[PDB]
């Protein structure tokens, strides 16, 4: 399964961000939420002006987000990923999450 | 003690999304988060003008320094119809005065204000896509043809007259947008056809429907009404004689609560009698501008259906 | 403030019975066969000689 | 004073619909 | 914050450290940054620099020159705004002596600190990751669970004894 | 011309250039900081308004006093709408509220009498030789900053208190008829309008979203070179992001 | 920057933010109830006009005097066409709205400080400059201008009502210290629930949708149905479900 | 020191004559008399709008104060189709920002000072002239016809981007105006034709070009980004998905080396990526007036080619 | 009386992912990858010669 | 100090026999609307004259 | 003072075109 990277992510921090994105020439839409007691971002995927989000899960490093979601024809078929720049026990923050900020998310999708 | 001060409320929904029932813009205000992103107390000027033809009615807004926010979510969306709603009346209570699809948006920020800009359309996108294939042999009854072309163009059913007991006369076969079709069949027959807020409006032309209307000095009128041509050329006559021409025009303050298709009466110190309505124009400027309505009427010589 | 309180232990109920293998469905069957490193199939093709 | 604008703009506007729109039987 | 090669306050060299420690470090501490980024930008005469011509100071202007001592000091005390972490300056003798010709001023700035943002890029962390058990501990249990409950006997017992 | 014009070509555009960076950096530095809060004391200071003078701190709130404030003046404005009616007469409709305009003329003199430290003119205004320190050009300096920096400027005067108030123009005449002082007027009118809590914070937008600008996939666009990696945790990393992530090629 | 600044930040923006609180709450309820009428005199008063004056209350007709009037001037305008007319068509001509305007002054020093004044609600006898009469005037002359009040103009010769400020001026020049000087416009204003059954008409309200946050127009909003307060869950229950059915 | 000051020059040359190979307007600069009639310091006002469509890009002049002999040169000629071009910059080069031929020109002299306008269109000549005659049958390589019209046109081509090893499905005839036969070729292949200051351009919608221009503050902006939409009617939706349907706007000081089918970046403190170039339009005033030009940005979601 | 509800909702929320693929942490991260026989390392002693 | 520093080829000063007044004035403009609510965006900076009289 | 004019102008050609071009599968 080759996978070319295609894609980053940055986030300001705010604790209700939410915008728009295009991947593998589709566009969909998403919402991060941030959660106090388990200082971690909640991240929703859905298409553009859905009633509801498709998906819902929990950010983690070095964990398959979409794993047991390639199975829906609104779901991208590529890989998204958390890990980190610095040194690797550094765990997802909340200001901590850009190209240089310490926490590299990214997209990266298959060859075809 | 108060003054008597203008007041309003614009109200952006989700997109447009037709399906295989009637649609209604009323369904479509709220947003994913909730309730709708309501502006109330910022200059606005806009232009609404109304009729009973083929064309849609089509409305003009602007507004002048919008938050960042609502023009982002203004930017997504660029590929899609939001619904919106205009209300205004005076302080007390706000009509209905137009509700649609965005079908233009754009934004220009030269230093020190900006400026946004809309083009609604009423209908407009059931109207151009509304295909249809249909066909009928000669006895079928008319009025059997005009209930099938309306249900296909999916959009609730204001008001119609029935043709009784008409037949067609040679077979007939209809393509392309039903609205055009049905456009036709109101030459052939004498009625007019024309969808507005939503509703769609099936009469016949030179009758009229009560007195819905008066228009009077205590009723805000403007001005002394004048006679208008109701069309800019005239036609070649054997001096249907019931069609229309003839009219007359009146202006009044802001009232939202008058479609093209209505009746009203005039009750003024020279001109007095009845009128069909032909044409509306809305306009309106909240800090700096008319907060006014025009009407353009138009004599009628046919039965009171 | 009961029926405030109630819908928390409703909600508790329900996430504890989403979670069993008897009460899967849907999305939450995913998951939970998800967290033993499987996943549903998609869109297969045909072979043929 | 675009008032005084819009209604040279309105003006031509009528011109051009009557240039289109004129005579005929139909 | 602002981070960088540390430069040490009395000789102007790299503060490689003391002899048992010796090695390179960073500017942390908001007030050691800016120590030398002051002294940077009072040090370097104003075009001097390749790669940037309006870095500097002019002293050109002012040294070789009769000039006013008030409108030196002016000059002096902007080019310490230009920081954009400064609070205030609190006091400014400046003084001037015919005979020698020398001018010296003295004056003092304060600047707050700041905080660290994230620790990603410094070192250690700060969570505390588990430890895992040692042998049948886990399937068995553990001892020290009879350890301190007699302890707790052993006390009790020594409580209640006046004592 | 000669090679030696050369160099003094180079001096206009340094020295000139040089000028505006000054000027332009500091204005930056302003609209950034957002707990520094100006505050004019047009009048009212000997009665009743020593209060609100007692509480600002030189640091973070600041006082502007004037050595003569010759007059001030307040005037709000309001629109009426009218229509006309077929009785040939007009009518009256919704009026609307415009804002309000402030205004007020002072001197800055070279020869002060009250030197009270606490001003914000006088921070550094020598006590004993006040000619020599340039007062009536440190004002300018300092009002100026103030205008072009935008801040939402506050008014003490003694019959009321105005907010939300932002400079539109100012004038500094040195005639001849004073001399040793400037003539300053200034006029302002009523601008009517991230960290914090999750709790208080509401559903943002940001609209359409491109690639970040800050890493890799913008120098395959922009054509440049990826940073290589610092090397520490090798032959841990490699194996995983080469296999889960790939290389964008 | 350091957390210091950022608990200095919020009380920059909580205290600027608590002025509009102020000053937008007191117009807001000032709109919201139209039986106070305000009333200006405007010289008249010793010349009989006191027997008006004696009417007014200290709660619904507020009345205002100046510590004095200086000038004040009164003026119509009308138009007529510039192009001769047919011929009698003598309708050629329209009325434009009245302007009245005047100028007065309120001193620290004043002579006369009669109580049914409304500027000397809770004013000192014996301290006049202490109770700060100019700033009390300038408070109730911004909060009648900003409600658009229907003001009632009592002056020597006539009787104006329904005039509504359109601007007004203050300053405090070098000369005449200890007082202010005050300009104001007005304009007429040619105006045109709970009420008799008898005195009704027939209204119109268009096109109307869902009305308010019910319980159908939760489910638009996606809001969670409000549960029902339990005093009674026997019988509507049986019959609620079954006849009226439930949003889904 | 000085001051930044702007200059242009306009350049006046022979009729353009179509023959038997691709015109290029560079050769009819000279005159009989060799030198060309250059005007350099006279107040002029022009503005010139381009785009990426069938139609043609025009420019319109004017010129105040013109010498009786230049306007009895134009005087004559008016049969024919005099070459012009047209250049601008800042007081030490100048880039050319139109060249096409002279459709109109007229002159009025009232009282204290004469004005003279003109029409310039972009290759209107051939684009409109050019006819056809040709077919094909089942299985020819659609890369064959593409080139054989393109001959037809009589003019260079500037960039093409052939399509493979596609073939016709269906036996296919051209007549009348080549130009009018390729843009239909455009909508059934998604493919862009457009030919501009006398280069052939033909690409593939959605699909984009490096960094050919960065604009900043440094690089002459003026004012921020707006997000403007690209087309005043929105069309139906799914919801080739690869088209256009996104866009922004940008001003930028007067740069005649800017061309609708290039690729620019946004270097800005909100917005920043990478879009195509929809529509330009260059305006100046020598004397008094802007001396900037706008463009029309539209996102992109097609693979770089 | 409203503000402690909101931790308790975001508890539960927190709780639900301890069972998944991702979201898992500290000691509920062992018993997701325990079912596949792995197990954390404990301190180590550096080697060499 | 600086006046000494003008040469005379190319650093060339003028002084004018007597100046009478001279004045310096900057001017801002903002929206005359009420803004959306921080927006402090909405104003803008324009030249700054300087005029004088002399003989 | 044409800047004025030519804006409306422009408006008008903008809602004319809107006019001509509107809805349509293609």
């Known amino acids: 399964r080759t996978v070319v990277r295609t894609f980053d992510f940055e986030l300001s921090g705010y604790p209700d961000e939410t915008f728009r994105v295009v991947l593998d020439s589709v566009t969909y839409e998403l919402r991060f939420m941030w959660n106090e007691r388990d200082e971690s971002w909640f991240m929703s995927l859905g298409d553009i002006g859905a009633q509801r989000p498709t998906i819902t899960s929990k950010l983690t490093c070095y964990s398959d987000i979409l794993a047991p979601y390639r199975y829906l024809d609104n779901v991208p078929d590529g890989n998204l990923y958390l890990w980190p720049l610095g040194d690797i026990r550094t765990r997802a923050g909340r200001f901590n999450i850009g190209p240089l900020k310490g926490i590299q998310m990214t997209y990266s999708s298959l060859i075809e | 003690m108060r003054a008597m001060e203008r007041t309003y409320t614009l109200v952006i929904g989700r997109p447009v999304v037709i399906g295989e029932k009637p649609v209604n813009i009323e369904k479509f205000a709220n947003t994913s988060k909730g309730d709708a992103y309501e502006i109330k107390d910022l200059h606005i000027e806009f232009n609404v003008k109304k009729d009973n033809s083929k064309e849609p009615n089509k409305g003009y807004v602007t507004v002048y320094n919008l938050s960042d926010e609502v023009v982002n979510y203004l930017s997504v969306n660029q590929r899609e119809s939001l619904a919106v709603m205009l209300h205004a009346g005076y302080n007390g209570d706000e009509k209905l005065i137009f509700s649609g699809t965005v079908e233009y948006v754009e934004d220009d920020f030269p230093e020190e204000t900006r400026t946004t800009k809309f083009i609604l359309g009423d209908g407009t996108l059931n109207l151009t896509t509304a295909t249809t294939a249909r066909s009928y042999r000669k006895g079928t009854p008319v009025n059997s043809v005009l209930n099938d072309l309306i249900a296909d163009l999916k959009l609730p059913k204001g008001r119609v007259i029935d043709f009784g007991n008409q037949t067609l006369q040679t077979s007939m076969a209809f393509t392309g947008n039903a609205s055009q079709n049905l456009a036709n069949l109101a030459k052939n027959t004498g009625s007019t056809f024309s969808v507005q807020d939503g509703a769609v409006y099936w009469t016949k032309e030179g009758s009229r429907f009560n007195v819905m209307f008066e228009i009077s000095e205590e009723g805000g009128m403007v001005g002394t009404p004048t006679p208008k041509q109701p069309s800019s050329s005239k036609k070649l006559i054997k001096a249907h004689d019931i069609k229309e021409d003839v009219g007359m025009t009146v202006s009044t303050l802001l009232n939202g609560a008058i479609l093209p298709e209505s009746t009203v009466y005039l009750n003024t110190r020279y001109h007095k009698g009845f009128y069909k309505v032909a044409e509306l124009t809305h306009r309106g400027g909240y800090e700096t501008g008319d907060w006014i309505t025009e009407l353009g009427l138009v004599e009628t010589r046919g039965e009171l259906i | 403030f009961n029926e405030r309180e109630y819908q928390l232990w409703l909600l508790m109920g329900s996430v504890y019975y989403a979670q069993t293998m008897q009460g899967a469905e849907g999305i939450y069957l995913d998951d939970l066969l998800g967290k033993r490193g499987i996943y549903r199939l998609g869109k297969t093709r045909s072979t043929g000689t | 004073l675009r008032n005084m604008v819009r209604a040279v703009v309105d003006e031509n506007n009528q011109f051009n619909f009557n240039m289109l729109i004129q005579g005929g039987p139909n | ?163 | 011309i000669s090679p030696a014009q050369q160099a003094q070509a180079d001096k206009r555009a340094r020295d000139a250039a040089a000028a505006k960076r000054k000027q332009d950096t500091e204005v930056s530095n302003a609209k950034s900081r957002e707990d520094i809060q100006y505050t004019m004391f047009v009048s009212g200071l000997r009665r009743g308004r020593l209060n609100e003078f007692e509480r600002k701190n030189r640091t973070d709130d600041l006082a502007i006093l004037f050595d003569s404030v010759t007059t001030h003046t307040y005037t709000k404005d309001y629109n009426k709408s009218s229509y006309a009616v077929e009785s040939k007469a007009k009518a009256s409709d919704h009026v609307t509220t415009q804002d309000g305009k402030f205004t007020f003329s002072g001197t800055v003199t070279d020869s002060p009498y009250l030197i009270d430290p606490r001003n914000m003119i006088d921070r550094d205004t020598d006590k004993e030789n006040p000619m020599l320190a340039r007062r009536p050009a440190k004002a300018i300096e300092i009002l100026e900053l103030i205008a072009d920096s935008h801040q939402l400027v506050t008014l003490v005067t003694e019959d009321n208190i105005l907010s939300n108030y932002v400079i539109t123009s100012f004038q500094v005449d040195r005639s001849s008829e004073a001399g040793s002082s400037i003539n300053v007027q200034v006029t302002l009118e009523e601008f009517r309008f991230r960290t914090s809590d999750p709790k208080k914070a509401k559903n943002a937008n940001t609209g359409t979203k491109q690639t970040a600008e800050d890493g890799a996939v913008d120098d395959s666009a922009k054509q440049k070179r990826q940073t290589p990696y610092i090397g520490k945790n090798a032959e841990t990393k490699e194996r995983w992001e080469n296999a889960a992530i790939g290389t964008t090629d």
């Open chain 5, 1 to 163: 914050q602002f981070k960088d090669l540390l430069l040490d306050p009395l000789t102007g060299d790299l503060d490689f450290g003391t002899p048992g420690d010796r090695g390179m470090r960073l500017a942390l501490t908001n007030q050691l940054s800016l120590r030398q980024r002051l002294y940077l930008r009072f040090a370097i005469w104003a075009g001097d620099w390749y790669f940037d011509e309006t870095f500097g100071f002019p002293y050109r202007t002012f040294v070789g020159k009769k000039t006013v001592k008030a409108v030196l000091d002016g000059r002096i005390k902007s080019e310490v705004r230009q920081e954009p972490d400064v609070l205030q300056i609190t006091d400014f003798q400046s003084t001037m002596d015919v005979v020698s010709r020398s001018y010296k001023c003295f004056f003092t700035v304060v600047t707050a600190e700041g905080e660290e943002i994230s620790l990603a890029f410094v070192g250690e962390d700060e969570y505390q990751y588990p430890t895992p058990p040692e042998s049948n501990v886990q399937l068995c249990g553990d001892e020290g669970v009879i350890i301190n409950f007699k302890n707790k006997l052993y006390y009790l017992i020594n409580f209640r004894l006046p004592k």
